[PDB]
Design an enzyme around this catalytic site. Structure first.
Site, mmCIF file in Angstrom:
data_model
loop_
_atom_site.group_PDB
_atom_site.id
_atom_site.type_symbol
_atom_site.label_atom_id
_atom_site.label_comp_id
_atom_site.label_asym_id
_atom_site.label_seq_id
_atom_site.Cartn_x
_atom_site.Cartn_y
_atom_site.Cartn_z
ATOM 1 C CB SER B 289 -0.857 0.104 1.180
ATOM 2 O OG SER B 289 -2.106 0.826 1.063
ATOM 3 C CD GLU B 290 -0.783 3.516 -3.549
ATOM 4 O OE1 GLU B 290 -0.869 2.148 -3.294
ATOM 5 O OE2 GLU B 290 -1.677 4.087 -4.242
ATOM 6 C CG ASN B 291 -1.436 3.852 3.163
ATOM 7 O OD1 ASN B 291 -1.459 3.191 2.210
ATOM 8 N ND2 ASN B 291 -2.106 3.726 4.105
#
Ligand SMILES: [Cl-]
Lengths: 461, 465
Positions: B289-291
């Protein structure tokens, strides 16, 4: 992550001529089992990207003993006689690269960044190029370094450095879980962490394999995505390079001690600056190998191979200390977060150029170029006033290779304290009692202003 | 570190016009107490560097409501109608900044790096200039972005991006020790960590202050050297933006067959994420997940819901065993470096040579690109588009040239629709490799805006079991 029992199986497909990243700072956090495995495979003509050269008989030194390395990329290569002989003989190619630059170039190579700008090395041989990378057997130069491009941003000059990637990385870590997540112990992290991200195939050796769930997910230093091959190391020797356990120079040390302020973050070089800390107030000492909160030398039973200072000495840490990787350490330094950098010097110029890494009669610059690269950090030089024969050390222009241009803010000698300004030059602000201004004039190779508020040189009680 | 008992005291000296970095990803890891303190001081004309702007009525959105922000530097407007409105109306300036670029430019600002190269945004308005920063009342552009310099390295084109710094940073963390060392919880780390390092004065709010010694020294996320001002937050509402608690199907069941054992994947909202539900228990796929998460799991049960744990779509999520958390700069180092094997996402248009448009419709959709430009930026990562074949009115989505602003040039490798699967070659164009049963090649010719080759080994479209 693929797990291996046999270190040789994990490295058996490295081809001759491969570029291999090797973790460690000094003998701290070195992949000793993976190095042992390469001795067995005999793979050769390697380009080794390794911060240091180990010592003659350990770490990277072992691969020099077997002549498996052709080229190195490193920041400091002292304490290895085999290295020196091979290099001087024209058997080894070597690019000396500033330590912070090495760390950031490796990071860039894992992060999809082909090139970036840095202040480190501007105005030095790193920027200029032309240094011998390889000799011929007759002592002539076979290969010289290339220049770095220079560009101005926000009124300051920077040089362009390119990413480093390897075909393989050989990484030492502390523990892995059964998923392949990895953690590092104390100052053994150093280059191991960024090197995990910058090679086609990463091979990690650990001391212990633990169950999935043994780590807090927030406290995984290298996530499994970066760990292609994992082996539990068969043997760990816990070797210690320098066992450290608990008048002109004293004058300098006792004045240098008065540079410390309460709450200050400082980085102290080998010798006088570090000795000055003994006279300190809360002062937090940073170590470029990835420590904040250095403490005194250990008692014998506090000695730990995973915890050394930048001088490669066994050390301790104080309460509320932290450890971090070499790329993070030099981000901290290059970004001007350290308040005070104190270091020794061979020469200082009128406008604050510094020469403290090379005497033409080769070990590398280590982190010195990075430490003086930010205008936000106060750089204080502590040195004896004059060299052999009252030869000047403070003078108009350095004659020895520069560590940095216009980077020194203060000079403390046994005779004098000078403030240094890039545009305005030197100002004598303290004078050892008994000496005269004319005494300073005779021992200094450039002019200086004398402060209206000149005082006798101060000494820590 | 200087400790404060009042958040307003910690921020009272921020001047009008200041540039302020603000932590958080959606409502996750937002400095709600420091934002409240700025509401009280009334400081204005700010340039706010923040990934998002919360929601209409919480997080940084509160400072849009109060008209205290002049310019946002952000990657995605998200579900903030007031942010979107102020921008379209010409009241707010916005630099739409690719999320990984945002993160790296901030990291550079803390690390002594004035500029660096990235492939993210090459061949798009980011590189070309012309991204609307301010609109006129009539929808024309008052302030356009300037071009980024292009340079080739190693046979690929990259763009030059410059460091971001702030006068102040407003950072949310979980715990601080009495020395000022700081740690973060779950996915609430995101931009908070790099923002700590990139401002003249950093202000951190924490949920708890603990004894020095509460942390292992290896596991301090932000060493005290970076933390100039520290306050314990008076109130934590633990707000959740999106509670997700536990022909399209045809696309999903074909997309599911893109997964391979051992694969690392980043899956976009909608169809790609739904495809992950059909992964066999006999296969191992790790979702990134890019977060700042690796190892995403199913949506939570009520008792598993955690405001510090959300996916890139801002939905409450869980993680699987052996998961890890990391900062936004590290997340995008992972992505831009090609460490993720598969990026699957939706699209509005794809060209015959693999150009992708999925972020902007002039005068209509102006929410930003989020992490999409970064996710398609590496030649090492396979890019699969999953989308309905045609648009409303049988308008073509696959065409010779996209008409909508590009997310990336020559970046898509495969297209999966309900009618067809195409392989995509940046030189030779499209090859029809699977055809939905019952459809003919002519059916595809009629619903596709360009020509294509038909594989000699064409098979009916596959579907997961
Ligand atoms: Cl977003």
């Amino acid at each position: 992550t693929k797990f291996y029992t046999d270190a040789v199986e994990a490295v058996k497909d490295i081809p001759n001529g491969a570029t291999v990243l090797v973790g460690g700072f000094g003998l701290c956090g070195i992949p000793e089992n993976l190095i042992g495995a390469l001795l067995k495979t005999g793979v050769k003509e390697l380009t080794a990207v390794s911060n240091n050269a180990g010592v003659d008989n350990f770490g990277l030194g072992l691969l020099l003993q077997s002549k498996q390395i052709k080229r190195m990329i490193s920041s400091y290569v002292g304490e290895n006689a085999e290295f020196e002989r091979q290099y001087l003989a024209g058997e080894l190619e070597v690019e000396l690269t500033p330590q912070g630059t090495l760390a950031e170039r490796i990071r860039a190579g894992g992060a999809g960044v082909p090139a970036f700008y840095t202040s480190t090395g501007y105005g030095t041989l790193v920027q200029e190029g032309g240094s011998p990378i390889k000799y011929n057997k007759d002592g002539s130069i076979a290969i010289a370094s290339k220049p770095r491009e220079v560009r101005e941003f926000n009124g300051q000059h920077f040089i362009l450095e390119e990413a480093i990637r390897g075909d393989f990385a050989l990484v030492k870590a502390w523990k892995a879980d059964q998923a392949g997540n990895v953690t590092f112990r104390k100052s053994a992290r150093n280059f191991n962490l960024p090197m995990c991200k910058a090679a086609e195939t990463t091979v990690v050796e650990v001391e212990e394999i633990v169950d999935i769930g043994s780590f807090a997910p927030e406290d995984i230093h290298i996530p499994k995505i970066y760990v292609h091959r994992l082996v539990k190391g068969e043997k760990y020797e816990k070797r210690i390079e320098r066992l450290s356990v608990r008048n002109v120079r004293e004058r300098i040390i006792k004045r240098a001690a008065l540079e410390f302020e309460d709450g200050m973050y400082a980085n102290l070089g080998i010798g006088i600056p570090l000795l000055a800390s003994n006279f300190i107030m809360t002062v937090h000492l940073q170590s470029e190998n990835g420590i904040l909160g250095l403490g005194p030398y250990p008692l014998q039973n506090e000695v730990d191979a995973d915890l050394i200072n930048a001088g490669k000495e066994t050390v301790t840490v104080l309460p509320g200390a932290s450890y971090f990787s070499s790329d993070e350490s030099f981000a901290m330094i290059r970004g001007g977060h350290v308040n005070l950098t104190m270091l020794g010097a061979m020469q200082v110029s009128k406008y604050g150029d510094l020469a403290n890494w090379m005497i033409p009669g080769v070990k590398g610059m280590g982190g010195a170029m990075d430490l003086v690269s930010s205008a936000k950090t106060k750089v204080v030089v502590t040195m004896e006033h004059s060299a052999k024969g009252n030869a000047h050390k403070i003078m108009e222009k350095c004659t020895l290779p520069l560590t940095g241009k216009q980077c020194v803010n203060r000079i403390i000698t046994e005779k004098a304290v000078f403030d240094v300004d890039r545009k305005k030059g030197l100002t004598l602000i303290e004078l050892w009692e008994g000496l005269t201004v004319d005494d300073i004039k005779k021992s200094t190779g450039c002019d200086f202003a004398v402060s209206p508020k000149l005082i006798p040189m101060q000494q820590v009680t």
